[PDB]
Design a protein around this ligand. Structure first.
Ligand code: NA
Length: 51
DNA sequence: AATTGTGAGCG
DNA sequence: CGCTCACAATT
């Protein structure tokens, strides 16, 4: 499968890789609108854990 | 005083 | 390259 990364979903949402990692694991500091971006980025794109 | 970004340490 | 963990320059 296409190795869709944390970055791809982050840029797609308009957020940082670390902000989007903190939507997956190590979760601190996530906002109303920013969260809803990450969700639409994860579900429209076929993100792969660890690739 | 809140977050992103950067650092670095694991794989 | 890809990611969790942890910490801090900037705002
Ligand atoms: Na992950």
């Amino acid at each position: 499968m296409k190795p869709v990364t944390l970055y791809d979903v982050a840029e797609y949402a308009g957020v940082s890789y670390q902000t989007v990692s903190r939507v997956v694991n190590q979760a601190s500091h996530v906002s109303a609108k920013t969260r809803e971006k990450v969700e639409a980025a994860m579900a429209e794109l076929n993100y792969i854990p660890n690739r």
